Every structure is written in structure tokens, then in C-alpha cells.
């Protein structure tokens, strides 16, 4: 016969969420903090996986703030941003791993497998020490939100941040260009970016262009059967797209969750919240639908290992 097991449902909706998470999604729609007005193709468009993969290659620009982008060409900013492109400094690589921060990484023993990739991408303050067996020890790129850089005092102390390439991102007003956003960042991480950058010059540290998250959101909203959270996508999803541009093959672990699915938010923290898995602020739900939809692994890989495989843009047909 055939195996009857539940891996991530590609067509999940608000009407598949707990009431408590349903309310939170409604509230975020009202707020519209970032002044989103989706005027793209009506939500609910059906894309092939190959087709949607090209769409993401073509309509999402993965670029870092360069010295040529006004106003990072002004004197006050001179000598802060890294000289060469991130593409130059990072790879290209064959097989890469994106490690979510999910609590379901607990007792996964995924460490050795994670470390057999050329590069590993982690998020925010996700630690490696004490968790190597489940989580690995290698950190090649670390993606952080601007809130952490701005307000986490440990960002300028903990050695964990001192490994590999750093990238920071900050949500901007919807469809904003670089100068307007510089005026109105969601968190003013600019001082601390300059401050860290003074302390670790030989550590590459980039700033994601503010447009990248929204260009991705537009695609999310185009696919989704309903209106999604008017907030930018989660760090996890950005980290995936980033790696798809740096690798030929990206493995994502415990994003689409395994059989160890749990309310425990992080592998490295002891608190529960279903929202970290199912989404609150971020349209994480619809991000997961997209990953499942582009998965080139089997369902069995998801259930047992929490593992999803996407091809790098470098390798696709168009
Ligand atoms: C992402 O990102 C990206 C990028 O960004 C960036 O990138 C970089 C790299 C660069 O590029 C920069 O720039 C950018 O920014 C993006 O993309 C983009 O986008 C945009 C849009 O939006 C675009 O723009 C456009 O452009 C064009 C062109 O340009 C050029 O130049 C420039 C400088 O600046 C550059 O940049 C570019 O690239 C180009 O270049 C080119 O290249 C090419 C290649 O590709 C080349 O080729 C070559 O060459 C050589 C030598 O020659 C040889 O030949 C070989 O073979 C080849 O191959 C070339 O050379 C070069 N050059 C040229 C020029 O070509 C422009 O044009 C445009 O403009 C237009 O349109 C617009 C809209 O859009 C408008 O507004 C304007 O106005 C115009 O229009 C026009 O107008 C005029 C008047 O004014 C008219 O005229 C008329 O006409 C008639 C007849 O017809 C008559 O005659 C009369 O009399 C008159 O008047 C006309 O018509 C019109 N037209 C129409 C159509 O309408 C624009 O500006 C760009 O390009 C892009 N880039 C890229 C790269 O792609 C994106 O978008 C992003 N994404 C997102 C999503 O966001
Ligand atoms: N339970 C969890 C916890 C985190 N994550 C992913 O890991 C990423 C990193 O988590 P933080 O952004 O909270 O540091 C999230 O943006 C999300 O994509 C998840 O998918 N499930």
C-alpha cells in the first residue's frame, strides 16, 4: 500500500490556523505598519515549480548596499561597507545548508549532515556551542535583523557573532528606495553597524538592500490564496533566497518541520509559541507553502529529517 503521513501542506490557509494565530493575522492586516498596497497580479496565481523558480530568479534582486548607492557614497560613510561584492567573497558553492532556529532541531542529530555542506547559513543569535550534535558547528554566513543589531547588547560582546560573513536587514516602508529608507529605518542600526565594523574590520559585514524583502513579498502575495501579513518575509525565507543565489543546491533544515514538530520556539531557548513555526508578524505560513512547492526532495525527507532541497538559481532553465 501507500504511506499515510503528514508533511507540510502546500495549500495551508488562515483557516488552517489556531484561532489565536488567526486573530494575530487579522490584527497585522489592519495595522499595515509598512504602508503596503499590493497592486500586482491578483492573489492566488498558480505557478509550476520550474516556472516559479525562474520568477524568483528574475524578480527578486539579492544585492547588498554598495558604496555607489546614495547615500553610502557620502563622506561620513566612507570606508565602512566591504570593498568587494558578497558574491566575490562567498563562493560560489555546491551544496549549502540553511539551518532554521526551530526547536524541532532538538535531538535531530543533524550536526554531521549539516557540516558536510560547503557553507552553512544561520540566523540572529542562534548558537552552535552546546548544540553541535543537533545543529552543527560550522557558520559561514549569519543573517541578522536590524532590531538585534540595534538593541541586542550582546551583539557587540558575544564571540559567536565573530564567525563568518555577517548580513543585516531592516524592514522598510513598502517599495521604498535606498535614500527614503535611510531616513526612516525600522530600527536605526546604523551606529552599531559602524561600531561593530570598527571592532572587526577583517569580518565581512553587509547590509541587505531594503527592496529585497518586498520584491520577495510581492511574489508571496501573488501566489497566496488570500491576503497575507503586510510585513516582510521572515529572516529564514530571505536566508534561503540568498543561498539559492550563492549555491547550486541548498538544503533547508527544520523550516518545513519534521516529525519532531513542537511548540518550543527555538532549539536554544525553552519557551513555547506556535507562532514561531506557523507565523505571526511574518507571512511564514505562505513562505513554507512556497518551499514545499519548490522542494525537490521527497516527502519522506521532510518527515524524518525536516530537510528540504531547492536548486540554486545558477542551475535552472530559462
Ligand atoms: C534588479 O536590479 C536591476 C539592475 O539595477 C541595476 O542593475 C545594474 C546592473 C544597472 O543595469 C543599473 O542601471 C540597474 O538599475 C534592475 O534592472 C534594471 O531595470 C531598469 C528598469 O527599471 C532598466 O532601466 C532601463 O535601462 C535602459 C537601458 O539602459 C542601458 O544603460 C544603462 C545605463 O544606466 C544600463 O544600466 C543598462 O544595463 C543598459 O545598458 C545596456 O546593456 C546592454 C546589455 O544588456 C548593452 O548591450 C551591448 O552593447 C554593446 C555595445 O553597444 C554591443 O552592442 C553588444 O552587442 C550588446 O550586447 C548596451 O550597450 C547597454 N547600453 C544600452 C543603452 O543599450 C533604458 O533605456 C531605460 O529607459 C527607458 O525606459 C524607461 C522605463 O523603464 C523610461 O522611463 C525611459 O524614458 C526610457 O524610455 C525611452 O525614452 C525615450 C525618450 O526619453 C524614448 O525615446 C524615443 O524613442 C522613439 C523611438 O522609439 C523616438 O526615437 C523618439 O524620438 C525618442 O525620444 C524611448 O522610446 C523610450 N523607450 C521605451 C521602451 O519606452 C530604463 O532606464 C535597467 O536596464 C535594468 N538593468 C538591468 C541590468 O537589467 C531590475 O529592475 C531590478 N529588479 C527589480 C525587481 O527591482
Ligand atoms: N520554530 C521555528 C523557529 C524559527 N524558524 C525559522 O527560523 C528563522 C530564524 O528565527 P528568528 O528569525 O526568530 O531568529 C525564522 O525567521 C523562521 O524562518 C522556523 O521556521 N520555525
From Swiss-Prot:
- Determine if Transferase is one of this entry's keywords: yes
* Pathway this chain belongs to: Protein modification; protein glycosylation
Oligomer and partners: Monomer and homodimer.
What is the name of the gene encoding this protein?
ST6GAL1
* Residues with the Phosphotyrosine modification: 281
Its post-translational modification remark reads:
N-glycosylated.
Per the UniProt entry, the glycosylated residues are 61, 73
Give an example GO cellular component term for this record: Golgi membrane
What terms describe the molecular function in GO for this protein? beta-galactoside alpha-2,6-sialyltransferase activity; protein homodimerization activity; sialyltransferase activity
Q: Which organism is it from?
A: Homo sapiens (Human)
Name assigned to this protein:
Beta-galactoside alpha-2,6-sialyltransferase 1
Q: Give the shown range, full length included.
A: 89 to 406 of 406
Q: How does it sit in the membrane?
A: Single-pass type II membrane protein
Q: Which UniProt keywords apply?
A: Disulfide bond, Glycoprotein, Glycosyltransferase, Golgi apparatus, Membrane, Phosphoprotein, Secreted, Signal-anchor, Transferase, Transmembrane, Transmembrane helix
Q: Where is the signal peptide?
A: none
| Entry's EC annotation | 2.4.3.1
User: Which BP terms from GO are recorded?
Assistant: N-acetylneuraminate metabolic process; O-glycan processing; protein N-linked glycosylation via asparagine; sialylation; viral protein processing
| Disulphide linkage map | 54-318, 96-247, 265-276
Q: Where in the cell is it found?
A: Golgi apparatus, Golgi stack membrane; Secreted
Q: What does this protein do?
A: Transfers sialic acid from CMP-sialic acid to galactose-containing acceptor substrates. In B lymphocytes, generates neuraminidase-sensitive lymphocyte cell-surface differentiation antigens, such as CDw75, HB-6 and CD76.
Family of the protein in this entry: Belongs to the glycosyltransferase 29 family.
Catalysed reaction(s) here are: a beta-D-galactoside + CMP-N-acetyl-beta-neuraminate = an N-acetyl-alpha-neuraminyl-(2->6)-beta-D-galactosyl derivative + CMP + H(+)
Amino acid at each position: 500500500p501507500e504511506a499515510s503521513f503528514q508533511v507540510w501542506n502546500k495549500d495551508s490557509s488562515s483557516k488552517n490556523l489556531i484561532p489565536r494565530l488567526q486573530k494575530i493575522w487579522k490584527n497585522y492586516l489592519s495595522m499595515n505598519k509598512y504602508k503596503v498596497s499590493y497592486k500586482g497580479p491578483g492573489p492566488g496565481i498558480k505557478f509550476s515549480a520550474e516556472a516559479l523558480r525562474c520568477h524568483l530568479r528574475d524578480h527578486v534582486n539579492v544585492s547588498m548596499v554598495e558604496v555607489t548607492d546614495f547615500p553610502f557614497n557620502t563622506s561620513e560613510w566612507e570606508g565602512y561597507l566591504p570593498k568587494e561584492s558578497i558574491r566575490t567573497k562567498a563562493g560560489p558553492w555546491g551544496r549549502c545548508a540553511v539551518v532554521s532556529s526551530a526547536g524541532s532541531l532538538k535531538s535531530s542529530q543533524l550536526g554531521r549532515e549539516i557540516d558536510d555542506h560547503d557553507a552553512v547559513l544561520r540566523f540572529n543569535g542562534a548558537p552552535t556551542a552546546n548544540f553541535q550534535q543537533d545543529v552543527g558547528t560550522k557558520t559561514t554566513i549569519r543573517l541578522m535583523n536590524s532590531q538585534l543589531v540595534t538593541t541586542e547588547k550582546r551583539f557587540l560582546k558575544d564571540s559567536l557573532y565573530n564567525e563568518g560573513i555577517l548580513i543585516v536587514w531592516d524592514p522598510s516602508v513598502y517599495h521604498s528606495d535606498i535614500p527614503k529608507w535611510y531616513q526612516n529605518p525600522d530600527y536605526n542600526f546604523f551606529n552599531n553597524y559602524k561600531t561593530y565594523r570598527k571592532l572587526h574590520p577583517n569580518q565581512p559585514f553587509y547590509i541587505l538592500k531594503p527592496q529585497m524583502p518586498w520584491e520577495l513579498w510581492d511574489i508571496l502575495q501573488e501566489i497566496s490564496p488570500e491576503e497575507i501579513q503586510p510585513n516582510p518575509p521572515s529572516s529564514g525565507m530571505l536566508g534561503i533566497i540568498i543561498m539559492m543565489t550563492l549555491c547550486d543546491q541548498v538544503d533547508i533544515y527544520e523550516f518545513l518541520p519534521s516529525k519532531r514538530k513542537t511548540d518550543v520556539c527555538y532549539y536554544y531557548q525553552k519557551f513555547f509559541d506556535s507562532a514561531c513555526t506557523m507565523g505571526a508578524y511574518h507571512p511564514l505560513l505562505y513562505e513554507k507553502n512556497l518551499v514545499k512547492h519548490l522542494n525537490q526532495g521527497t516527502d519522506e525527507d521532510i518527515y524524518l529529517l525536516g530537510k528540504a532541497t531547492l536548486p540554486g538559481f545558477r542551475t535552472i532553465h530559462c
